[PDB]
Ligand binder design. Sequence first.
Ligand SMILES: CC(=O)SCCNC(=O)CCNC(=O)[C@H](O)C(C)(C)COP(=O)(O)OP(=O)(O)OC[C@H]1O[C@@H](n2cnc3c(N)ncnc32)[C@H](O)[C@@H]1OP(=O)(O)O
Ligand SMILES: CC(=O)SCCNC(=O)CCNC(=O)[C@H](O)C(C)(C)COP(=O)(O)OP(=O)(O)OC[C@H]1O[C@@H](n2cnc3c(N)ncnc32)[C@H](O)[C@@H]1OP(=O)(O)O
Ligand code: NA
Ligand code: NA
Lengths: 192, 192
Amino acid sequence: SMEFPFDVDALFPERITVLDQHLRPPARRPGTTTPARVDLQQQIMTIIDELGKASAKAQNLSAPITSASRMQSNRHVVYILKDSSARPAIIGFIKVGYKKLFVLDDREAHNEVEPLCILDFYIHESVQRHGHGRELFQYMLQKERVEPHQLAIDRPSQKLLKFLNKHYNLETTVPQVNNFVIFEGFFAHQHR
Amino acid sequence: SMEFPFDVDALFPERITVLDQHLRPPARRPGTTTPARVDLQQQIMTIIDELGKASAKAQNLSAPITSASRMQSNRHVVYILKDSSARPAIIGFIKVGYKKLFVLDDREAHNEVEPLCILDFYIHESVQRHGHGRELFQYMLQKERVEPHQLAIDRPSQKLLKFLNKHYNLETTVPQVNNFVIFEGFFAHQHR
Ligand SMILES: CC(=O)SCCNC(=O)CCNC(=O)[C@H](O)C(C)(C)COP(=O)(O)OP(=O)(O)OC[C@H]1O[C@@H](n2cnc3c(N)ncnc32)[C@H](O)[C@@H]1OP(=O)(O)O
Ligand SMILES: CC(=O)SCCNC(=O)CCNC(=O)[C@H](O)C(C)(C)COP(=O)(O)OP(=O)(O)OC[C@H]1O[C@@H](n2cnc3c(N)ncnc32)[C@H](O)[C@@H]1OP(=O)(O)O
Ligand code: NA
Ligand code: NA
């Protein structure tokens, strides 16, 4: 299980914490002496760096695709799952963002579009296949106000393909040259 | 945790079970009514098939690299780790075999050789990073009568590269065109 040299429960009061390019420390309930926000932001940056590294090891990548730096220079949104009732905290994350994609269609019509993309997604190995990925995915869909078949996925893994099929009945449609994956229903003339 | 529709503790009495192309059922202590060996062998084949599929999902491969069929047609040896004291069994495996490799050296001498190769290796996600991989690797080295720096690795993952460096001080040497990895000391003129 993952761990940091600072109080993650204080930093992240909610079970799922949303962060964007501002990397803004969550507000806390009044009363406690809160560290300086600059220092809280460095804690968040270290968490994102380490989560990105862990995801890269899980995915057999030579370099992370998620980092604090890349958060600050992009318009990515990360959702970080803690357990507040852990004994004796951070479980994983999902990172999304809108991307311009020059997408190939199936009747062969081809074009541009900017869907919300699933960019990185990781649940710690020890608690994979327990339902944490689904909780995190569900929360992200609700906040982004997106439906599953509207997504594009950047280079999904085998585990993720199975996940998407199980939870959302997502079936792949036309392969795409750009290595993003889209599903039946992505195009308006498709069903589901 | 992994699970099968038959008694793995009866099938595999030892914590680490070695199997080769014969896929021979382990002998048991006298007394129990043992199923027919053909049926025990089918149980073993199903275990190897499922372990290979799990390893392929872990590794983001489109197809397994380990299967009962491929065991029977190759000269591969698999070491399967159970826990006999599990509550309320199979943890993972390592697969090895000798392979002819047309290896590129570092003073640029180049040639043929047939080292023992690490071909597949998987510990269930739930108990990765607990020391199970090391126990299994240690047992395999002792049985094969091989030293770590004598090995070649078929397409090691990032996790495995870190593992080998931690436990055995293995540092990569000349990259190889064949996608196998070898370490300093593989060649007789190298140290360690
Ligand atoms: C764009 C990208 O981010 S690609 C990279 C995606 N991330 C990774 O592949 C990293 C490693 N894997 C993980 O981090 C996680 O397994 C995730 C994020 C893919 C899924 O989250 P989880 O918490 O494991 O999933 P959750 O428990 O909610 O759902 C389980 C389902 O996911 C799929 N799944 C999860 N683990 C596996 C596995 N080892 N083998 C096959 N399918 C799996 C299956 O559909 C499974 O349902 P099943 O058990 O009925 O077969
Ligand atoms: C030729 C091939 O088989 S390539 C494919 C290898 N298999 C895989 O990559 C599948 C997924 N991973 C696994 O199955 C396992 O993690 C294995 C087989 C690689 C290693 O077995 P484990 O039981 O996890 O290793 P064990 O606990 O004995 O040793 C731990 C060490 O392995 C490495 N390691 C294990 N998990 C990770 C990880 N998530 N991130 C980075 N390094 C890791 C580290 O060196 C670690 O030591 P550390 O915790 O001090 O950093
Ligand atoms: Na993983
Ligand atoms: Na894994």
